[PDB]
Structures are given as C-alpha cells and as structure tokens.
Design a protein around this ligand. Structure first.
Ligand SMILES: NC[C@H]1O[C@H](O[C@H]2[C@H](O)[C@@H](O[C@H]3O[C@H](CO)[C@@H](O)[C@H](N)[C@H]3O)[C@H](N)C[C@@H]2N)[C@H](O)[C@@H](O)[C@@H]1O
Ligand SMILES: [Cl-]
Length: 297
C-alpha cells in the first residue's frame, strides 16, 4: 500500500500537465483507496494507495464523467487524469474542489427547522435523480448485483476461514448466508446507479446559505440497490427522524424493508471485515471480524 511525497505528486502531474502551475499542496484527506491532495485550493487530486484503489479511482472518474450535469447538487468534476501502468489503472485524477463542510449530525441539528427540512428535501431530490439516471451503458464492472455479491462473499469466507473456524461455528456461517439468500427482499430491487457511500462525511454544507452545496466521493458508486443510500444515512450518522424525512420526500413506499435491510447489513459487517481485512491487509479488521463470527447468530 503505497504513499507519496509532495515531490512525487508534483512530478506526476507536471509530466502530463506541464503548464499547470502548482502553488500550494497539502493532504486534504485519506481513505482506504486513495490519498487526497488539495492543490491551489481549487482541486482535489486523488492518488491510489494501491492497485485496488486505482480501480476504484478509475471507476469514479468514469462515473463522474457520464453523470456530469445531470444532478441537482454540485458533484466533483474531472479536470485532470493520470495514465495506466502495470500497477495502476489510473495513476491519479484531479477533481474540482467543492467548498463546504461535512453536514455532520451535530451541525444538522443545530440548524433552524426550515434548514433541516430543506436539507432532507435536497438530499431526497438528489437521490431521486441519481437513482433515475439511465444505467444502460454502464458495464458489469460498475454493476453490483447483490445476490452475486453475497454468493461471491460466501465462497471467499469459506476459502478464508476454512481452517480458522470450528465445526459448529462454520455451520452458523452457512445458516446465516442461507437465511440471507432465502429472503427475497434483498434481491428484488430495481437496479439503479447509487452513491453507495452516502453518509454525512460526503455531504458538504454551506453555512452561509444554510444549504447543502455538494456531494462528493463517488469511488464506491455502482449499479445496485437504491436502498443502500438510505441505510448508509442511519448507521454514527443521522437519526431515524431525519432519514424518515428524506424517505418521505423520496416517496419511499416500504420503510420497514429499509430497516430490515439495515439490520441485515449491520450483522453482515463482521464478514466484510474478514474479506477486506485480508484483501486490504487490515489485520485488526480480520481479527475483529473473526472474533465476532465466533460468538453470535
Ligand atoms: N467504520 C465502522 C463502520 O463501517 C461501516 O460504515 C461506514 C463506512 O465504512 C465508511 O466508508 C468506508 O468503509 C466502506 C466499507 O468498507 C467502504 O466501502 C468505503 N469506501 C470506505 O470509505 C463510510 N464513510 C461511513 C459508514 N458509516 C459499517 O456499515 C458500520 O456499521 C460501521 O460501524
Ligand atoms: Cl498543461
């Protein structure tokens, strides 16, 4: 999992964009996939920490380009792109920086009621349009069929914890995965483009106008279940009271299902920690997930 010096970042950009003068550069943030650099306080440059992260970066670029000027809220726009190597699909990507601060649950509840209501309505309107984008042309590398995902994870879990679990413990894993695949509600959704990481950290807020001024980080965006973008808002995120406002402005017809999917995904995070803990090499995630699996059902 690679890192970069400011010297390296400036070199990589100069190679492809010589006339682009860099005056200021600092670490804006860091995720599991990329390190974010704020350059000239105008752009956010994402550099992949590893090969897997570069694929996410490549997909974010692809998705952001085709949904450009189709959404009611400002989203990052691709301005600079890197090159493929034998290690990365995308060496880097430069996006427009969206000004604003994360709409934290604490900031949200300190707002006047009219601003809170407008925030819920703006979020619902954004999701309504996002989930309505024509997803034909989006190739299967952007498609996240949930049933395929569950079945693929199961095979990964078996191959991973084959010698890590005792008899009865692996039986519970079989039971849990069977109960999920047995429930038709998890797979009956109409596939749409989703943000797939729709939380408070990625909802930027303009404190001067008291309005939401951007949605960022589309690195996990894919064609899947629209309910994913509501579940992610109640995980520590927004209270159920505020999400219900969004859901009702969204005209959602089956809230208890969203809550059921919410409970399932909460329990499912244990298995995610095993897979990601071994893929991303997060040995603390692996041991956490392994401890949790060895305990409940
Ligand atoms: N941390 C502990 C929490 O983890 C998940 O929730 C969080 C996501 O993890 C974050 O995103 C990162 O993790 C995702 C899953 O690996 C990646 O897809 C994504 N690219 C990553 O940036 C997202 N910003 C906030 C969300 N509340 C679980 O659902 C939650 O129960 C658990 O308490
Ligand atoms: Cl240039």
């Amino acid at each position: 999992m690679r890192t970069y010096t400011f010297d390296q970042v400036e070199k990589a950009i100069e190679q492809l964009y010589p006339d682009f003068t860099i005056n200021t550069i600092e670490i804006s943030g860091e995720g599991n996939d990329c390190i974010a650099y704020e350059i000239n306080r105008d752009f956010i440059f994402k550099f992949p920490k590893h090969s897997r992260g570069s694929t996410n970066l490549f997909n974010e670029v692809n998705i952001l380009k085709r949904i450009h000027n189709k959404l009611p809220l400002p989203i990052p726009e691709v301005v600079f792109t890197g090159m493929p190597s034998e290690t990365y699909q995308m060496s880097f990507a430069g996006f427009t920086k969206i000004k604003g601060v994360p709409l934290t649950p604490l900031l949200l509840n300190n707002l006047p009621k009219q601003s809170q209501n407008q925030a819920a309505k703006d979020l619902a309107r954004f999701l309504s349009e996002l989930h309505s984008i024509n997803i034909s042309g989006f190739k299967s590398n952007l498609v996240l069929d949930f049933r395929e995902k569950i079945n693929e994870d199961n095979k990964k879990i078996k191959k991973l914890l084959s010698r890590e679990l005792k008899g009865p413990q692996m039986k519970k894993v079989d039971d849990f995965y069977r109960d999920i695949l047995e429930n038709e509600i998890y797979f009956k959704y109409y596939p749409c483009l989703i943000h797939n990481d729709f939380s408070s950290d990625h909802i930027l807020f303009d404190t001067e106008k008291n309005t939401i001024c951007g949605i960022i980080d589309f690195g996990d965006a894919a064609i899947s279940d629209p309910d994913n973008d509501f579940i992610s808002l109640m995980e520590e995120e927004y209270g159920m009271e505020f999400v219900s406002k969004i859901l009702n402005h969204y005209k959602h017809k089956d809230i208890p299902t969203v809550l059921e999917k919410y409970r399932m995904k909460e329990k499912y995070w244990s298995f995610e920690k095993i897979i990601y803990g071994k893929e991303y090499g997060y040995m603390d995630w692996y041991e956490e997930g392994l401890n949790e699996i060895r305990s409940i059902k």
